[PDB]
């Protein structure tokens, strides 16, 4: 059924599962026309499909040409997401196919269920977690590949870099969600925190800086402070 904080450790068991977030698939800027009406201009988007146990991220880049001449784009985007997730599953070897797909938004349930009718044993589930995956486009290397794309493209990443050498997947996921929540709440300050120190760099093959264990503790505390600071700014606390 639905996925919440009671059964949270289920995310890190040995049943292959994927999160799917569609919040960055259909992206637009809104602007005035010469006649003073309003128009949208699409920009490239992405499907965010993540294995929370291994950190493997299947980033399908959605090029603006897929919207050309189409109507009801916000509805189309959910079905296109479902189509692409189905195509990804079919492309994987049987023993790599997920047993569960968790959608971050309930409006993805019916589109994904209909596209996956051929896989009656893959469970399609919502979640009661509020996951900050929309902020993935605040990760510089991910935003860069999406915006440079001139055609549809799938790019594979490990969103945990090399962290699983030192920490469990439960802890890696908690670190990721804290980082993305901070980037969602105050992107400038979060990137300031992550990059302030020039002697800690991002390896060419990584998305995040090469923090020691002790520095990750400091970074995590600074991110919690940012979130708390912003909470107080928002509600005047």
């Amino acid at each position: 059924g639905a996925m919440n904080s009671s059964n949270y450790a289920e995310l890190f068991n040995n049943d292959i599962k994927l999160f799917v977030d569609d919040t960055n698939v259909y992206r637009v800027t809104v602007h005035k026309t010469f006649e003073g009406n309003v128009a949208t201009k699409a920009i490239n988007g992405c499907i965010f499909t993540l294995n929370p146990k291994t950190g493997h991220l299947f980033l399908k880049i959605i090029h603006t040409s897929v919207w050309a001449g189409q109507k009801r784009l916000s509805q189309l985007a959910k079905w296109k997401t479902a189509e692409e997730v189905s195509a990804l599953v079919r492309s994987l070897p049987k023993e790599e196919q997920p047993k569960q797909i968790i959608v971050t938004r309930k409006a993805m349930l019916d589109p994904l269920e209909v596209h996956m009718l051929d896989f009656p044993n893959i469970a399609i589930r919502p979640t009661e977690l509020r996951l900050p995956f929309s902020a993935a486009m605040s990760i510089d290397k991910l935003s860069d590949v999406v915006m440079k794309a001139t055609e549809p493209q799938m790019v594979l990443f490990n969103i945990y870099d090399d962290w699983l050498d030192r920490i469990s997947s439960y802890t890696a996921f908690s670190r990721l969600t804290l980082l993305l929540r901070a980037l969602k709440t105050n992107e400038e300050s979060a990137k300031m925190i992550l990059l302030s120190d020039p002697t800690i760099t991002i390896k060419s093959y990584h998305l995040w800086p090469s923090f020691t264990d002790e520095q990750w503790i400091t970074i995590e505390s600074q991110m919690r402070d940012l979130i708390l600071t912003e909470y107080g700014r928002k509600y005047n606390v």
Binding site: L76, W79, A82, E83, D110, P111, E113, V114, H115, L117, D118
Partner: protein, 300 residues
């Protein structure tokens, strides 16, 4: 005009005949129902005074044989039977009629209600939904499940309605997922009408039968089928115009006949609000929308 005689009425019971109902007290001179209009299917149904559990009844057509009712004290119900001795049957009926021991089917001349509820319903199709091949009539009761209800448990005693499932491979062409889910026309016209039912008359017949079993027996699986068959049409952008006009008439007479006090349990708010106000056919059912809004504005 035809007749369903009763051997006797040993237990007090409310007897239904089509949309009419009357009470018989435990021993009275009750020997059946006369003046039944030839040309329609009919249903004779029962609710016992001392145990309203199990409404049950029998669909029949007087053109297919001579039928009568006899109480069975072992199985504790009124049973329909066929009399093959035609001369015996005619003499029994004549005597009861000469004795004024039968109630008259109480049809008003002006009243087309029963035709309007059974226009497309045929005995032959009833007997394929309700499988008991040694009888020319068909038993239905309040608790019988449908084939679809069983898939989700005695198959011989089931209602074999046509399974309708909007999230099934039958309903959704590979490659046309969004199209077929948001617009059920493929499922309606190719799968169901061309494929399974062959024509809209058989579709409407099963739709009407489902409604009548829901109304007369409180059969929940029948109510589900009735609403499914409505929603399938209303959720299709492409429906033959004659089907839409006929559906509007069908539904109008069903809503007109529904007892006002059973509306809470026989009408699905979601289906009706979607069909009348959101669906492709939201503006195609003018008669049905008018009676629904005047009779059941609460549901809407």
């Amino acid at each position: 005009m035809n007749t369903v005689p009763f051997t006797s009425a040993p237990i007090e019971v409310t007897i239904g005949i089509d949309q009419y109902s009357f009470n018989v007290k435990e021993n009275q001179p009750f020997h059946g129902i006369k003046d039944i209009p030839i040309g329609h299917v009919h249903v004779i149904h029962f609710q016992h005074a001392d145990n309203s559990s199990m409404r049950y009844g029998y669909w029949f057509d007087c053109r297919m044989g001579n039928f009568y009712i006899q109480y069975d004290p072992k199985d504790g119900l009124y049973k329909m039977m066929e009399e093959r001795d035609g001369a015996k049957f005619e003499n029994i009926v004549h005597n009861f009629k000469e004795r004024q021991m039968m109630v008259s089917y109480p049809k008003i001349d002006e009243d087309d209600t029963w035709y309007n509820l059974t226009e497309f319903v045929q005995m032959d199709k009833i007997r394929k939904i309700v499988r008991k091949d040694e009888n020319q009539f068909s038993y239905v009761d309040s608790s019988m499940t449908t084939v679809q209800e069983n898939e989700l448990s005695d198959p011989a005693h089931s209602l074999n309605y046509t399974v309708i499932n909007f999230k099934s491979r039958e309903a959704i062409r590979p490659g046309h997922e969004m199209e077929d889910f948001l617009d059920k026309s493929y499922y309606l016209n190719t799968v169901m009408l061309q494929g399974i039912f062959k024509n809209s008359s058989n579709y409407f017949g099963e739709l009407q039968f489902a409604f009548l079993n829901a109304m007369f027996f409180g059969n929940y699986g029948s109510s589900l089928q009735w609403h499914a068959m409505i929603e399938l049409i209303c959720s299709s952008a492409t429906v033959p115009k004659h089907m839409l006009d006929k559906l509007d008439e069908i539904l109008y007479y069903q809503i007109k006949t529904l007892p006002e006090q059973y509306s809470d349990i026989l009408l699905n708010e979601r289906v009706w609000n979607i069909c009348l106000y959101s669906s492709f056919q939201k503006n195609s059912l003018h008669n049905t929308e008018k009676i629904m809004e005047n009779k059941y504005p609460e549901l809407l």
